[PDB]
């Protein structure tokens, strides 16, 4: 990098390190993701190839921009736009104060626009967690880290099982479903909506069975009525305790009726009935932020 000066390490994963970097002659600050190729027995990792190609076709104001890809000697640098903070650091800094309801509603609205754009382009993110949601000082929030993202077919086929971070993993994944698609991202966004409201992870499990039981304790143990096919799923056990669904006035006390309605539709057990990102945008909870558009036909 003959013009980007590395200023600070901001991230680390299996495939490389992320740096804050400042352009010397411009003062343009970017995020540099370095992938060392000389250490990989399989060349450019599948995660780097998927992230690059998927991001070249996903330009949206609520999706972190991939500015450039550079091959240098035994390295691959991905240049991204820089955002000064993630939603996890912001929720933690506001844990005693709270996040004002209009900012919660605005961040949710924007995340849903970024997500509806992904889903309409047949892209599943599959790693929605507060640390992958980046905020700026101008009220914007964007989706970042498409390293676990995947293009999906219509119809979908059997994909990678072990796919979302535990606390944000949808129950159809935990119960061993053969198929999944866009509804897994909506479940993670529902968990984050509640986390913004209470400043506590909604379902903070320490294992797969514990994650399922925390979900069941809040939403009630699903049955064939609320979720046709639950009892025939690979990891369903008739021995599961039978908890009653808790009232959302206790689950998310600062939330209003419209907020509670939207949250319950994003956390619907049945992936086929769970609200889509496009339909979530039309929910009355956002009526004071968006105006409906005239529909042809």
């Amino acid at each position: 990098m003959e013009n980007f000066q590395k200023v600070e390490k901001i991230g680390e994963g299996t495939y490389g390190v992320v740096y804050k970097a400042r352009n010397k002659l411009t003062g343009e600050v970017v995020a540099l993701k370095k992938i060392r190729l000389d250490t990989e027995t399989e060349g450019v990792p599948s995660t780097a190839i998927r992230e690059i190609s998927l991001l070249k076709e996903l330009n949206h104001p609520n999706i972190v921009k991939l500015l450039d890809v550079i091959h240098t000697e035994n390295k691959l640098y991905l240049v991204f736009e820089f955002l000064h903070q993630d939603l996890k650091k912001f929720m933690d800094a506001s844990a005693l104060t709270g996040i004002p309801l209009p900012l919660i509603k605005s961040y949710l609205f924007q995340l849903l626009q970024g997500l509806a754009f992904c889903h309409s382009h047949r892209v599943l993110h599959r790693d929605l967690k507060p640390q992958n949601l980046l905020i700026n000082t101008e009220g914007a929030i964007k989706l970042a880290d498409f390293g676990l993202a995947r293009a999906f077919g219509v119809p979908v086929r059997t994909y990678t099982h072990e796919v979302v971070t535990l606390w944000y993993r949808a129950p159809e994944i935990l119960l061993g479903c053969k198929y999944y698609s866009t509804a897994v991202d909506i479940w993670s966004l529902g968990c984050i909506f509640a986390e913004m409201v209470t400043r506590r992870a909604l379902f903070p499990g320490d294992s797969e069975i514990d994650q399922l039981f925390r979900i069941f304790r809040t939403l009630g143990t699903p049955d064939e009525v609320v979720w046709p096919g639950v009892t025939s799923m690979p990891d369903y056990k008739p021995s599961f305790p039978k908890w009653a669904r808790q009232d959302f006035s206790k689950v998310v006390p600062p939330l209003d009726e419209d907020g509670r309605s939207l949250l319950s539709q994003m956390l619907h057990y049945d992936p086929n009935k769970r609200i889509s990102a496009k339909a979530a945008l039309a929910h009355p909870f956002f009526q004071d932020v968006t105006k409906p558009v005239p529909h042809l036909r």
Binding site: S46, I49, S120, R122, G153, V154, K178, T182
Partner: protein, 262 residues
């Protein structure tokens, strides 16, 4: 849109992906040392390696598209470079599409020593940099998947007969072996192959195209369709370690080279 996110929005993004991924039917004119049959023997061989490693039809079609689109950026490729360009297109495709793709050494091994792991690593970077990292096309087989679901109507859960999918896929595999297929959009080719196994009514219902949109590709595909009919279509195979509901998505190989002569 033939589909029942917004129906027209998802469908228009799909149609506008063929309009951004450009491919030319006479790319072998930029490589005067090459003949159209060299491409056919290469793609046919790539199908056989796909079947050996139980790779998905999607990863064959990604490799086919990376190869044809990569050659449009190059010039003066020799017959001896072909095996490396193809096996490296398949390496990228399998890493993008499979959950547990074959290791780099398996890709080097299948070339019988003609391509080393380091040559494949050098080639995959040349390929990906020349394609400007545009590695997410809507392949020919991906359109067939879309059409087969709408025929048997939820569009995201796979609900359709496996054996019929295999018979249409078999026809597309022959047509892709001919460079003139690249004149027709990928969605047009899949709809035209589907038409040969059904009708314009089923075609229009599952694909949204009118018969005038498809008419030219249908007439071009005519000889390929009769050679398959003359021989009798294949039966759905079973593959060990591959679930039954996914068996139709595994790439297969047959005497398509002989069939292509007619």
């Amino acid at each position: 849109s033939p589909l029942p996110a917004n129906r027209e929005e998802v469908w228009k993004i799909m149609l506008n992906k063929e309009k951004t991924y450009l491919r030319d039917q006479h790319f072998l004119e930029q490589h005067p040392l090459l003949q159209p049959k060299m491409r056919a023997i290469l793609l046919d061989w790539l199908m056989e390696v796909c079947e050996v490693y139980k790779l998905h039809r999607e990863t064959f079609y990604l490799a086919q598209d990376f190869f044809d689109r990569y050659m449009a950026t190059q010039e003066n490729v020799v017959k001896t470079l072909l095996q490396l360009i193809g096996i490296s297109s398949l390496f990228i495709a399998a890493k993008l599409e499979e959950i547990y793709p074959p290791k780099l050494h398996q890709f080097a091994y299948v070339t019988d020593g003609a391509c080393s792991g380091d040559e494949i690593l050098t080639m995959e970077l040349m390929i990906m940099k020349a394609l400007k990292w545009r590695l997410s096309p809507l392949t020919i087989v991906s359109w067939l998947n879309v059409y087969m679901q709408v025929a048997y109507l939820e569009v995201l859960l796979p609900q359709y007969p496996q054996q019929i999918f295999i018979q249409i896929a078999e026809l597309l595999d022959l047509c892709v072996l001919d460079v003139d297929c690249l004149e027709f959009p990928y969605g047009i080719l899949a709809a035209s192959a589907l038409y040969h196994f059904s009708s314009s009514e089923l075609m229009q219902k599952v694909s949204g195209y009118q018969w005038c949109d498809i008419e030219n590709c249908v007439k071009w595909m005519v000889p390929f369709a009769m050679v398959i009919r003359e021989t009798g279509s294949s039966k759905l195979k079973h593959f060990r370690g591959v679930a039954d509901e996914d068996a139709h998505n595994i790439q297969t190989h047959r005497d398509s080279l002989d069939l292509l002569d007619k």
